[PDB]
């Protein structure tokens, strides 16, 4: 799975045990797994188990979750996006 | 997409325009697309467009569709399976 | 498909004919198929059909299923996890 600082999960609206897609900007690999919470303030992004074959320390990734909803709701939906820089600093 | 003899679609409960997975037994490639109907009795399995990079004439494939349902229904669900031999002859 | 000892399916809440993901720790391959029951007690994890191109005997894998539910329920959801030691001996 991928262990993710709980602050980051909150900012992106991603839940513990939720399915996530990881898109690796560095090497182009794309895979799906689930999220687990890391300690708040740790700034951890840990790719564990089999997924360690698809990402390495230092790689830049996008981690996304998807939900379903009816069409009218979808047409006004605004995703929760957290942007990062530096030492996995969340941009405000 | 994958064009499939309508008799085969009926036997497997697969609908025109339904999402399908194709698992290629010959070369191990796995991909997802959607089904379109070919003429009844044609026995066609045509892999079209981009999917032609993942299968060739003569390859043996499994074509599957998935549905969602609540747990109690899922525990008594029986999939619609059509078995083939020879000249895409559906085994009765 | 992947045939799996019914005892293992029971522990993980995975159903016969349910969609499953298989993530191969040994070779990094990741694929999706559906589950079938192998005999109970047998310890069998058998990768059948086209899937045999993605795993070999002795490979270590993770087998997972996913369900949907509303956000309100998902917030407290607890998955069913089975852990293994030695030769598919469930702990």
């Amino acid at each position: 799975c991928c262990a993710i600082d709980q602050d980051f999960l909150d900012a992106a609206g991603i839940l513990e045990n939720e399915a996530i897609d990881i898109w690796n900007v560095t090497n182009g690999k794309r895979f799906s797994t689930y999220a687990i919470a890391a300690e708040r303030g740790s700034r951890i992004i840990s790719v564990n188990g089999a997924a360690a074959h698809c990402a390495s320390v230092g790689d830049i990734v996008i981690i996304a979750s998807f939900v379903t909803m009816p069409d009218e709701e979808a047409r006004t939906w605004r995703p929760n996006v957290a942007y990062f820089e530096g030492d996995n600093e969340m941009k405000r | 997409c994958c064009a499939i003899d309508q008799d085969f679609l009926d036997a497997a409960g697969i609908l025109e325009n339904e999402a399908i997975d194709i698992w290629n037994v010959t070369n191990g490639k796995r991909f997802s697309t959607y089904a379109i109907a070919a003429e009844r009795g044609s026995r066609i399995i045509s892999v079209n467009g981009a999917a032609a990079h993942c299968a060739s004439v003569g390859d043996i494939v499994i074509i599957a569709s998935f549905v969602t349902m609540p747990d109690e229904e899922a525990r008594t669900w029986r999939p619609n399976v059509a078995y083939f031999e020879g000249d895409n002859e559906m085994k009765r | 498909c992947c045939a799996i000892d019914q005892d293992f399916l029971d522990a993980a809440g995975i159903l016969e004919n349910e969609a499953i993901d298989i993530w191969n720790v040994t070779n990094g391959k990741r694929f999706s198929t559906y589950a079938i029951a192998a005999e109970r007690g047998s310890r069998i994890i058998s990768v059948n059909g086209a899937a045999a191109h993605c795993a070999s005997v002795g490979d270590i894998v993770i087998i997972a299923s996913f369900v949907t539910m509303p956000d309100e329920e998902a917030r407290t959801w607890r998955p069913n996890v089975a852990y293994f030691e030695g030769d598919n001996e469930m702990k």
Partner: peptide, 24 residues
């Protein structure tokens, strides 16, 4: 809104058999 959640998993099992031949 509907979430997709891990239902369950078998963690680190070993593949005991692998045959291209399956009819079922």
């Amino acid at each position: 809104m509907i979430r997709t959640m891990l239902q369950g998993k078998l963690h680190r099992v070993k593949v005991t058999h692998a045959d291209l031949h399956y009819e079922g």
